[PDB]
Amino acid sequence: PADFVPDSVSGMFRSHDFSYLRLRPDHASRPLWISPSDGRIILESFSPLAEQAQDFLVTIAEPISRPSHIHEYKITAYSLYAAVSVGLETDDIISVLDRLSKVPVAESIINFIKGATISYGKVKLVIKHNRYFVETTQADILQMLLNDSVIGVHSFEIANESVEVVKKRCQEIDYPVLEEYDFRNDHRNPDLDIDLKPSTQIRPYQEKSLSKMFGNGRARSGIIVLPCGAGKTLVGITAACTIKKSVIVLCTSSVSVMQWRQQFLQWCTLQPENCAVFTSDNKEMFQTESGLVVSTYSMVANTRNRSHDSQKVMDFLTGREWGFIILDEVHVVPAAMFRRVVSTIAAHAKLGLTATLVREDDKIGDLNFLIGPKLYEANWMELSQKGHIANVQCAEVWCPMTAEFYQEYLRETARKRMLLYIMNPTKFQACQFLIQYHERRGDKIIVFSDNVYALQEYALKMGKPFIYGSTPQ
Amino acid sequence: SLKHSVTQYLEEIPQQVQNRLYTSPATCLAIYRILPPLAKFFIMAMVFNENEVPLLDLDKWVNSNGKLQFQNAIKSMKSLHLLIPNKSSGTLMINLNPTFKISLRNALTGGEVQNSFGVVVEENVVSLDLLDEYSANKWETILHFMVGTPLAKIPSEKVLNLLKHSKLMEEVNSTGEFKITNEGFQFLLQEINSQLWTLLLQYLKMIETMDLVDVLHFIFMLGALEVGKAYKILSETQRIMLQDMRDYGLVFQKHSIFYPTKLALMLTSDTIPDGSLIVETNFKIYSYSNSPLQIAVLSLFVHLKARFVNMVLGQITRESIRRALTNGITADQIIAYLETHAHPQMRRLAEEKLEKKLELDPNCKEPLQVLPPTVVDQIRLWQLELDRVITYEGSLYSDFETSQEYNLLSKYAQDIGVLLWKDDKKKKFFISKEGNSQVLDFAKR
């Protein structure tokens, strides 16, 4: 920005005006716009090279919003940390960005990328005989890490519970840790002979995600985000079948565990003898050398109260050195104590599967040092238009509250008005009319209701069943 | 709307003034082009013959199908008193105005014109470098001051006064600021030709005692002139009028010779796109436009967040929409702007959407919606939110001795259309403050 006259409307844009730069002669072909301040990337999906940029932008920049025409990504420190791991350097990123960018990359952006892209690949966390060793292929790193207040080819032991602390300290310090598992050369862990039967099929986006995960050839650790119903179960089964090592799956439900196991057996050639389900009903474990243990966070994170059989199961889990952990619905791992299982349970590889990588509190960022960065994400409308998923006509019904109840709404406190505006008659009448119309249309209807009292009242009024926590399996 | 507006203003003028207005061929050549094609055909037929033709002969020319067009043509021609109907010998003979006839004859046959079109100095200047830049800059300054964006060189007191005295650009000294109105947004939505015509028409109405005929002589002669050439300097009123017109960016003066500009020719007749934009389901706007005028007008109903050389990106928010609505802008006008500045990608996707809709159900021809219906619904819902509370000023009538009297007064109010609410059980009703006096007088009588 030198000798550039501001426009009369420049005042409206507070340090956001980007007219101080000029456009390249090949703007008609280059589809990318880069924000020098906020890091937001505007992608033209209707211009040449759009497909070539759609995956690279997903890799290096998180998606903010991806509507039909114009896509919106954003570059952040975590995104760059995820990108720098998979054989990507600032030189290559800048080369591609310049070749695809209508505008030249600013020195500030270059500095920001350089600061964070040159601090990776000097520490590796390994496990040997149920002992966690922080092995570093270089020794000079000691002169700063061992001299730092928190820390403390050379390898030193570290407390299993202190993993959650050391990983966050590594994030704060220049070098973060990477968890790579060379299952090809890993012979100590007994192998499990399970493969995907011919009936299995892998969708194009599933194959793309697996390619982004195994491009180098060594299995990394991280998180996979796919829309609900995209095939996360099949993705996990494929990962387990290709790794061929002892694996434990944690799911936040019992019906989910049942179907997890059912799909597991259906999709792969897993023998029933090698399969074990760890729930409240039956706690038996496979007696084979290698198998899979499917349990729940409640059955893995509890430490005070355990049954006799469940205590033997927990002792088995702790004594054996697991090889892979699959966390379904990982958005709950950063909870007060569920994060403790990551540090306590021993495993060389951690995979998380979740359709949403956001949560109300700020602990979402802790996932970076808890399990690793995000690997792949998939759009919704793209799959909807490609036929992989369904199209929805989402609607919001405005039910006017009647005066009799509204007059009480005004006076009632915060706690009572909640039930008051949820049990208004207009909602009942609209629900009845919609039920009749859609039943004549022959649609299968689900009515969700968090409030148990409202659910019961609606069910008893309409003569239809209700299901909630008290309902037995 | 161009020809309609000019014709309406010319129709409102008195016949005595029109007769003097038709003296100069320059004005006649401009007025002639505005009439409908059938009227122009009849005028050309009548100009070259020095005789009177009955109206029935003219009716014979039009076919049965164009019989409707014949009525509009004759009505429009008679409204301006261009054709003088003389009835004698039992026949409604039709004749042309002698002054208009002579003016057209002189213009077409190169007869004496009294230099109505002006002369040529044969000293040409660079139109692209100077004329185009000057007019573009000055029109941009006036439009920038209209849209309200800050600008250093504020417009002159002449145009500022015209703006204030016109409905355009409502201003209040108590507030100490100027704001755009509904007519202002419509003016900004209109094309360049209509944008110039609106201001010129407002000037025509504003001027008082500078002859009305002289103003039209100058404007139509300016439309006659061609850009990129010199014209030596005319009426005494036209001198100051020329200086004033220089304030609108139509004619350029060195500081003895005046030069018409591109807008001068734009006045006579008409003549990826800049301004086309993409609207996303996330209430985001990406306009592939590089122009401060477009940016400022978008800022009226868009909460701008950043900008690039090639495009402008913003977000629609309740605050910005409420600002635009409070300025008097209608959601219909906003959607009209978005639709007429829709991107080719949006238009193609909407065409595919309409094709899919018709393919699924070709029996019903659904309307073509370029942008998602959710945005339209949200904007109209916000307008409804602004319109939620309804209040009127007036008085309440009660304590009626007799139901007959109560019904009589309420029925009278309803008949005169000043009744807003009534209740027979309570024998009460409310009337507007405007009709309060009439209702009171009727009650007394």
Partner: peptide, 10 residues
Amino acid sequence: STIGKTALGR
């Protein structure tokens, strides 16, 4: 788009 309709109810 049913915005101008009267609100639903009894």
